[PDB]
mmCIF file of all heavy atoms in Angstrom:
data_model
loop_
_atom_site.group_PDB
_atom_site.id
_atom_site.type_symbol
_atom_site.label_atom_id
_atom_site.label_comp_id
_atom_site.label_asym_id
_atom_site.label_seq_id
_atom_site.Cartn_x
_atom_site.Cartn_y
_atom_site.Cartn_z
ATOM 1 N N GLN A 116 92.147 96.759 87.421
ATOM 2 C CA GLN A 116 92.174 95.275 87.789
ATOM 3 C C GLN A 116 93.551 94.756 87.760
ATOM 4 O O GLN A 116 94.372 95.251 87.041
ATOM 5 C CB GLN A 116 91.232 94.493 86.911
ATOM 6 C CG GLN A 116 89.890 95.166 86.573
ATOM 7 C CD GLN A 116 89.010 94.317 85.769
ATOM 8 O OE1 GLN A 116 88.108 93.687 86.344
ATOM 9 N NE2 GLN A 116 89.040 94.433 84.447
ATOM 10 N N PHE A 117 93.841 93.607 88.396
ATOM 11 C CA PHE A 117 95.068 92.944 88.543
ATOM 12 C C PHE A 117 94.874 91.485 88.298
ATOM 13 O O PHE A 117 93.952 90.822 88.697
ATOM 14 C CB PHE A 117 95.666 93.143 89.906
ATOM 15 C CG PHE A 117 96.927 92.266 90.242
ATOM 16 C CD1 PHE A 117 97.964 92.329 89.384
ATOM 17 C CD2 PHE A 117 96.822 91.374 91.154
ATOM 18 C CE1 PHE A 117 98.985 91.440 89.600
ATOM 19 C CE2 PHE A 117 97.950 90.452 91.510
ATOM 20 C CZ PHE A 117 99.019 90.576 90.655
ATOM 21 N N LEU A 118 95.886 90.912 87.495
ATOM 22 C CA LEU A 118 95.888 89.595 87.133
ATOM 23 C C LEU A 118 96.195 88.643 88.250
ATOM 24 O O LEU A 118 97.245 88.756 88.911
ATOM 25 C CB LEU A 118 96.871 89.428 85.986
ATOM 26 C CG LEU A 118 96.894 87.987 85.258
ATOM 27 C CD1 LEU A 118 97.135 88.322 83.844
ATOM 28 C CD2 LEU A 118 98.072 87.210 85.821
ATOM 29 N N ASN A 119 95.168 87.703 88.567
ATOM 30 C CA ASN A 119 95.539 86.788 89.690
ATOM 31 C C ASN A 119 96.688 85.885 89.544
ATOM 32 O O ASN A 119 97.691 86.016 90.253
ATOM 33 C CB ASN A 119 94.268 85.962 89.788
ATOM 34 C CG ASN A 119 94.467 84.857 90.920
ATOM 35 O OD1 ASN A 119 94.434 85.208 92.055
ATOM 36 N ND2 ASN A 119 94.479 83.641 90.474
ATOM 37 N N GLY A 120 96.758 85.004 88.465
ATOM 38 C CA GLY A 120 97.780 84.017 88.398
ATOM 39 C C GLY A 120 98.521 84.253 86.988
ATOM 40 O O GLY A 120 97.966 83.974 86.007
ATOM 41 N N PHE A 121 99.759 84.584 87.162
ATOM 42 C CA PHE A 121 100.693 84.788 86.013
ATOM 43 C C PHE A 121 100.940 83.370 85.395
ATOM 44 O O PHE A 121 100.857 83.300 84.141
ATOM 45 C CB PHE A 121 101.972 85.447 86.252
ATOM 46 C CG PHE A 121 102.819 85.702 85.173
ATOM 47 C CD1 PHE A 121 102.413 86.620 84.190
ATOM 48 C CD2 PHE A 121 104.099 85.196 85.188
ATOM 49 C CE1 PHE A 121 103.227 86.784 83.057
ATOM 50 C CE2 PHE A 121 104.861 85.432 84.061
ATOM 51 C CZ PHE A 121 104.492 86.191 83.011
ATOM 52 N N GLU A 122 101.277 82.418 86.167
ATOM 53 C CA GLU A 122 101.785 81.125 85.697
ATOM 54 C C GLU A 122 100.725 80.411 84.949
ATOM 55 O O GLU A 122 101.076 79.631 84.014
ATOM 56 C CB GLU A 122 102.248 80.260 86.960
ATOM 57 C CG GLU A 122 103.326 80.936 87.752
ATOM 58 C CD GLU A 122 104.796 80.934 87.187
ATOM 59 O OE1 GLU A 122 104.806 80.799 85.896
ATOM 60 O OE2 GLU A 122 105.716 81.036 87.946
ATOM 61 N N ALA A 123 99.444 80.689 85.200
ATOM 62 C CA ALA A 123 98.357 80.037 84.456
ATOM 63 C C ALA A 123 98.345 80.685 83.002
ATOM 64 O O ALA A 123 97.980 80.130 82.001
ATOM 65 C CB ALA A 123 97.099 80.196 85.148
ATOM 66 N N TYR A 124 98.616 82.028 83.013
ATOM 67 C CA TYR A 124 98.649 82.726 81.719
ATOM 68 C C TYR A 124 99.740 82.186 80.824
ATOM 69 O O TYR A 124 99.650 82.056 79.590
ATOM 70 C CB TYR A 124 98.824 84.262 81.842
ATOM 71 C CG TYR A 124 98.907 84.949 80.546
ATOM 72 C CD1 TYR A 124 97.785 85.636 80.048
ATOM 73 C CD2 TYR A 124 100.022 85.121 79.873
ATOM 74 C CE1 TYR A 124 97.773 86.310 78.935
ATOM 75 C CE2 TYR A 124 100.092 85.799 78.654
ATOM 76 C CZ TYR A 124 98.963 86.389 78.226
ATOM 77 O OH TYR A 124 99.092 87.126 77.030
ATOM 78 N N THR A 125 100.860 81.700 81.441
ATOM 79 C CA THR A 125 101.942 81.059 80.747
ATOM 80 C C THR A 125 101.501 79.798 80.201
ATOM 81 O O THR A 125 102.026 79.311 79.119
ATOM 82 C CB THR A 125 103.156 80.845 81.638
ATOM 83 O OG1 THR A 125 103.401 82.138 82.421
ATOM 84 C CG2 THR A 125 104.331 80.580 80.854
ATOM 85 N N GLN A 126 100.597 79.079 80.877
ATOM 86 C CA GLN A 126 100.031 77.761 80.370
ATOM 87 C C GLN A 126 98.732 77.910 79.643
ATOM 88 O O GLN A 126 97.902 76.960 79.856
ATOM 89 C CB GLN A 126 100.050 76.775 81.586
ATOM 90 C CG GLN A 126 101.294 76.507 82.240
ATOM 91 C CD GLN A 126 102.338 75.863 81.411
ATOM 92 O OE1 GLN A 126 102.030 75.398 80.297
ATOM 93 N NE2 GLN A 126 103.590 75.868 81.898
ATOM 94 N N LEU A 127 98.495 78.998 78.917
ATOM 95 C CA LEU A 127 97.318 79.051 78.084
ATOM 96 C C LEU A 127 97.559 78.383 76.754
ATOM 97 O O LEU A 127 98.845 78.183 76.396
ATOM 98 C CB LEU A 127 96.976 80.503 77.899
ATOM 99 C CG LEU A 127 96.377 81.296 79.019
ATOM 100 C CD1 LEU A 127 96.531 82.727 78.824
ATOM 101 C CD2 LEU A 127 94.913 81.017 79.072
ATOM 102 N N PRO A 128 96.648 78.028 76.008
ATOM 103 C CA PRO A 128 96.853 77.555 74.633
ATOM 104 C C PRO A 128 97.061 78.671 73.613
ATOM 105 O O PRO A 128 97.842 78.574 72.770
ATOM 106 C CB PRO A 128 95.492 76.791 74.293
ATOM 107 C CG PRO A 128 94.518 77.528 75.120
ATOM 108 C CD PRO A 128 95.107 77.966 76.398
ATOM 109 N N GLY A 129 96.346 79.789 73.873
ATOM 110 C CA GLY A 129 96.433 80.938 73.022
ATOM 111 C C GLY A 129 95.172 81.901 73.181
ATOM 112 O O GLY A 129 94.679 81.850 74.261
ATOM 113 N N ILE A 130 95.045 82.733 72.208
ATOM 114 C CA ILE A 130 94.137 83.791 72.253
ATOM 115 C C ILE A 130 93.135 83.563 71.054
ATOM 116 O O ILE A 130 93.385 82.945 70.112
ATOM 117 C CB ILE A 130 94.929 85.165 72.014
ATOM 118 C CG1 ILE A 130 95.900 85.312 73.207
ATOM 119 C CG2 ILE A 130 93.985 86.391 71.955
ATOM 120 C CD1 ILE A 130 96.735 86.598 73.075
ATOM 121 N N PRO A 131 91.939 84.054 71.202
ATOM 122 C CA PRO A 131 91.015 83.956 69.995
ATOM 123 C C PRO A 131 91.537 84.791 68.765
ATOM 124 O O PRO A 131 91.551 84.251 67.706
ATOM 125 C CB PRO A 131 89.765 84.715 70.506
ATOM 126 C CG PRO A 131 90.131 85.465 71.667
ATOM 127 C CD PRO A 131 91.172 84.633 72.347
ATOM 128 N N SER A 132 91.968 86.040 68.980
ATOM 129 C CA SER A 132 92.885 86.661 68.008
ATOM 130 C C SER A 132 94.165 85.905 68.036
ATOM 131 O O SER A 132 94.512 85.226 68.994
ATOM 132 C CB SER A 132 93.072 88.133 68.345
ATOM 133 O OG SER A 132 93.880 88.700 67.428
ATOM 134 N N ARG A 133 94.944 86.052 66.912
ATOM 135 C CA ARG A 133 96.117 85.198 66.728
ATOM 136 C C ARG A 133 95.838 83.695 66.728
ATOM 137 O O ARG A 133 96.603 82.950 67.359
ATOM 138 C CB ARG A 133 97.297 85.580 67.618
ATOM 139 C CG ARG A 133 97.285 87.063 67.976
ATOM 140 C CD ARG A 133 98.620 87.455 68.721
ATOM 141 N NE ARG A 133 98.750 88.943 68.469
ATOM 142 C CZ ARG A 133 99.741 89.606 69.021
ATOM 143 N NH1 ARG A 133 100.652 88.985 69.889
ATOM 144 N NH2 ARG A 133 99.802 90.927 68.957
ATOM 145 N N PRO A 134 94.747 83.277 66.234
ATOM 146 C CA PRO A 134 94.346 81.795 66.576
ATOM 147 C C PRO A 134 95.175 80.839 65.995
ATOM 148 O O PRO A 134 95.504 79.851 66.567
ATOM 149 C CB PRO A 134 92.827 81.860 66.030
ATOM 150 C CG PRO A 134 92.857 82.714 64.870
ATOM 151 C CD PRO A 134 93.930 83.744 65.142
ATOM 152 N N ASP A 135 95.514 80.974 64.620
ATOM 153 C CA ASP A 135 96.401 80.066 63.920
ATOM 154 C C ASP A 135 97.692 79.890 64.548
ATOM 155 O O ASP A 135 98.250 78.793 64.385
ATOM 156 C CB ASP A 135 96.600 80.566 62.542
ATOM 157 C CG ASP A 135 95.256 80.678 61.683
ATOM 158 O OD1 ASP A 135 94.269 79.938 62.017
ATOM 159 O OD2 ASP A 135 95.215 81.633 60.830
ATOM 160 N N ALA A 136 98.151 80.829 65.291
ATOM 161 C CA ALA A 136 99.489 80.659 66.086
ATOM 162 C C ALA A 136 99.121 80.250 67.444
ATOM 163 O O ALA A 136 98.842 81.024 68.368
ATOM 164 C CB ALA A 136 100.161 82.022 66.115
ATOM 165 N N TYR A 137 99.269 78.870 67.693
ATOM 166 C CA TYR A 137 98.947 78.263 68.888
ATOM 167 C C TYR A 137 100.289 78.400 69.845
ATOM 168 O O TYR A 137 101.400 78.058 69.308
ATOM 169 C CB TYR A 137 98.579 76.865 68.803
ATOM 170 C CG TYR A 137 97.237 76.686 68.048
ATOM 171 C CD1 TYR A 137 97.410 76.593 66.785
ATOM 172 C CD2 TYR A 137 96.119 76.545 68.645
ATOM 173 C CE1 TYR A 137 96.183 76.433 65.908
ATOM 174 C CE2 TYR A 137 94.911 76.392 67.950
ATOM 175 C CZ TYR A 137 94.968 76.303 66.668
ATOM 176 O OH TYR A 137 93.831 76.129 65.872
ATOM 177 N N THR A 138 100.037 78.814 71.059
ATOM 178 C CA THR A 138 101.170 78.889 72.073
ATOM 179 C C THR A 138 102.064 80.139 71.813
ATOM 180 O O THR A 138 102.832 80.424 72.726
ATOM 181 C CB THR A 138 101.973 77.684 72.164
ATOM 182 O OG1 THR A 138 101.060 76.507 72.176
ATOM 183 C CG2 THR A 138 102.780 77.649 73.458
ATOM 184 N N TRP A 139 102.007 80.710 70.598
ATOM 185 C CA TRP A 139 102.486 82.073 70.462
ATOM 186 C C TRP A 139 101.281 83.032 70.271
ATOM 187 O O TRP A 139 100.139 82.514 69.948
ATOM 188 C CB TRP A 139 103.443 82.195 69.279
ATOM 189 N N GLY A 140 101.491 84.300 70.490
ATOM 190 C CA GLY A 140 100.436 85.299 70.532
ATOM 191 C C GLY A 140 100.135 85.598 71.965
ATOM 192 O O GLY A 140 99.628 86.666 72.211
#
Side-chain angles (χ1 to χ4, degrees), residues 116-138 140:
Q116 320 183 90
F117 168 59
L118 184 143
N119 176 68
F121 185 60
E122 303 282 23
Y124 181 97
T125 315
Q126 300 297 348
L127 288 158
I130 299 179
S132 179
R133 326 194 159 172
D135 300 330
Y137 300 85
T138 312

